[PDB]
Amino acid sequence: AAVTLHLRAETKPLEARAALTPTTVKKLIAKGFKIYVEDSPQSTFNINEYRQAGAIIVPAGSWKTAPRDRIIIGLKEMPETDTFPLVHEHIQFAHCYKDQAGWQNVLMRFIKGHGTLYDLEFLENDQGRRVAAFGFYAGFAGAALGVRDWAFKQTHSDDEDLPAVSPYPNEKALVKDVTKDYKEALATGARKPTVLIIGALGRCGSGAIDLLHKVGIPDANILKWDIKETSRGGPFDEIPQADIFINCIYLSKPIAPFTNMEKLNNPNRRLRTVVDVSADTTNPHNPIPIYTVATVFNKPTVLVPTTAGPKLSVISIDHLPSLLPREASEFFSHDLLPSLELLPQRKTAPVWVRAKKLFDRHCARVKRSSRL
Template identity: 40%
Template sequence: MQQVHLWLRDEVKPFEQRTALTPSDAEKLIKEFNFKITVEKSVTRAFDDEEYVKVGCQLVESNSWITQAPKLEENDNFYILGLKELPLGNTQLGDIQVPHLLSQRHIFFAHCFKRQSDWKDTMSRFVQAEPRPGQILDLEFLNLDNGRRVAAFGYAAGFNGMAMGLLTYCKQKLHSNDLEVLNEIVKPFKNRTELVNHIKDLLSKLDHTPKCLVLGALGRCGSGSVKCAELCGIPESHLIKWDLNETKAGGPFPQLSTDVDILVNDIYLSGEIKPFLTMEMAQKGDRRMSVFIDVSCDVTNPFNPFPINNQVTTFDRPVRRVDNTNNLPLDVIAIDHLPTMTPQESSDEFSNALVTYLAELRNVNFSNEQGETEGIRVWLRANQLFEKKVQEFKQEL
């Protein structure tokens, strides 16, 4: 059994503060499973660099994986771990020239396996690398034998999505729909309790309770949205929960626009479906909804069920106003990393779920099709999915 070398990279996405591996879980991998762990310095990560050093990690400069990390042909037991997208190829990152082609094995959310608009560019960076192509083990598709994901930020995304919806609605009403106030930078909260207390304080200043609807309410994201609304004091009469039974007939659904104040999209888009809400419907005079939170953020997916939203927003500019019919704004929030509103809590939950399967990497042989344990099969399936996407990519060249 060879030693696994795990390299935790710094995140380049603006405002990202989460990590896939916390110091306590890094310590577990080092002490119990003989991992070697390298951690890049970070000024944004929710955990201080020194916390990693104290548990035995080697600290290196931010983004140094680009020039120092071994390629697959040099070390088959080396993995680069991150969360969000990699720096763009052929760009300058400080003093480092970022190459387009990548020959390492990366574990992260690649967002390219569902034919997103830039999926070919992402795949090309790995597939066309020589002499040995790189590899993606996508965190979104690390699944158990029963199909359930081993680790996900879904609950946190849904929770924080509803929180953003309630915050935005309160600001609309308390500040006369002033878009500049709505677009004040969103700073992270210590934990969900602090976030909920802040929302409850704002809601107490309103003379009414907003009516909310959660799409995908029975899923991981949806359950987070529902829980947030409940903790913030939204009564059951004002919290509508839709899931497959309510949407199986196919859209569009006019009541999403006319019957609620806040709409939260938490669905998991796995294939083609009819639009749930069109811009034409949103521009009608009977629209009541003023806040739409697109937690799913499938804006680059050709089957996006919400054509009213075609771009993501950011923590420094969270709201995009897409309509103002009858002086009633329709404000869209589509931040694609909502869990970083509560970065330490979200990271703790994710890392705690993932670490058991990271430990299994020491037993994985990617040349085998069958694994002896479920933990091994998690990684073999991820590799098989990547190889399948490689073939799809090559067929469309």
Template identity: 40%
Template sequence: MSDSIHLWMRHEARPTERRAPLTPADAAHLVAQGLRITVEASDQRVFPLADYTAAGCASAPTASWHEQAPDDAYVLGLKELPDARTPLRHRHIYFGHAYKGQAGAAELLARFTAGGGALLDMEYLTDDSGRRVAAFGYWAGYVGAALAVLHRRGRLTAPLRPTDRPALDALLAASASHDTTTTALVIGALGRSGRGACDALTTAGLTATRWDLPETRALDRAALLDHDLMVNTVLTTDPVPPFLTKADLDDPVRRLSLVSDVTCDVTSDCNVLPVYDRTTTWDEPVRALRADAPRLDLIAIDNLPSLLPVEASTAFSAELAPHLARLAEWDGVWSRALHTFETAVQAQETHHVR
């Protein structure tokens, strides 16, 4: 049945997005199983278009999916769609960030409703136990912690540029001998992102304090503020008491001088760090939350894995590809994602009626 599935992998609208949800090697395996795959040209994707066509994929012009993709194609991407108000008629597979009240969520869902399409949000592709089947978390945590260490040690330069893990690890290791006093805290240390953050800190010669559910249920705020840097990797779907408040920022005995927020749930009611209102960027990766002593800097980049595009894409694609192969079967992973979308649309419609 897989020969009835047509995947259309789009060019990413965000200029700093280098990743791909599907690598050429994994695309070749899917083509061999009968899937049709069309890949748009992209001057920023880390894998050349020629590698996809060599794998048996068709090619299409950049950003042509809206006009040229057949109605029954699944449009595959990663980050946000181009800013437009046009109705969306396709089924899209990407990180939509539209189910927790984020900025622009209502408008995005309205576009799907108007066009008859659907969002199969990658964040909500889960197995029977509720665990995500494909995630960039490890590499997000790794890069988020690495940038924090490099900034702490005066080695972070902007604008940021994509690199690979050996080069990044060399930077971390080279600066380790000059830093023997930094204390680091990772919140959510047992998750994918948390493990990545801890590994990066170990490479940098630091032994992190590791907190997970038990520590966040009964948060020791004084202990949190007594670390030099904190990496937050917690993603929650329900509002919880914040880990850091604006009152904490003004605490005169605060030691904490750097926060790296890997989660970047900044416009959601589920944000556990409601102390900032906009993310940072590759051009300006660090922003001061408090410029006066004691200073507190923030790193909050919402596409961290794109700074290690080959490693991140390869790992993610390996997890996602087997589920793309089963799209025609419409198994639990995909049916749950569609149900989540339909529930969100229904909730929005109910809200408007009220």
């Protein structure tokens, strides 16, 4: 019943996280698994770390010719330019269950090769909770950039914007960089910022709070809100009153927004930075209707066109965990490990059976002449 996992190197541009880390590979091998790991220069992990963990090192792309019994595990989707049949059982975020452009073609590759897709985004426990995501570090990274933008505004003129950001090698490095910016801001006479976090109880909230504490922002300066508070109904005066606002709650139904331009266009507004960790350009009812652009690492902030009050910017990056690829990967792999240990019995174990049945359901939606 021994299982063989093959960690394919990511091809998606700039993706430096990994589905399995050296630490998790070591544990799996200790559990009887056989693990192959493809060399990946862009990975934040050095290939030698996997070698020392006991992995069999192979060339990038080797999975395409690997024995059919190997389970191919990766993080991001396959290149839309690849069209050959997928014959293996794959574990990955395929992004083809929400009618994404070209989703049918994605599934057709599996159908043609008689392969199987166990999508990471829908892998859940028996209670319905996802087994592995990147919430904590999405909030941690979000808070880090939030502090950096707030600090930038204290040390530069409004004519300048926060410069391009890049992934950090480890948490210590990120905290050190944010702390430096932070201290430089305080040196000018700015007071320690007040931070409002909506969704403070979830993992994203926990992550944001952890970054704030580590940078030195007092627990007293953090207003921790969640459903209990948001249930009052927006707009919330606490948002314009805070120096930094971090949102961790995803809302897409018709309800009063958390804030709006009417409330932001006020000379007494203190708010300088809004980090919407739940940012989604595809959201039909954005609870923070003050931006339409999804910012990116090379241009992290976008101006909110206010008519009164100090310069206000939004950070709407949808892949914040990529700012700390190593830690994001360690947390993710750790959370995923228990499910991975059930692969030997994936034919009957609900966590995997659910994923397989989900795959079958979506495949059944695909009607093509080539299947006749």
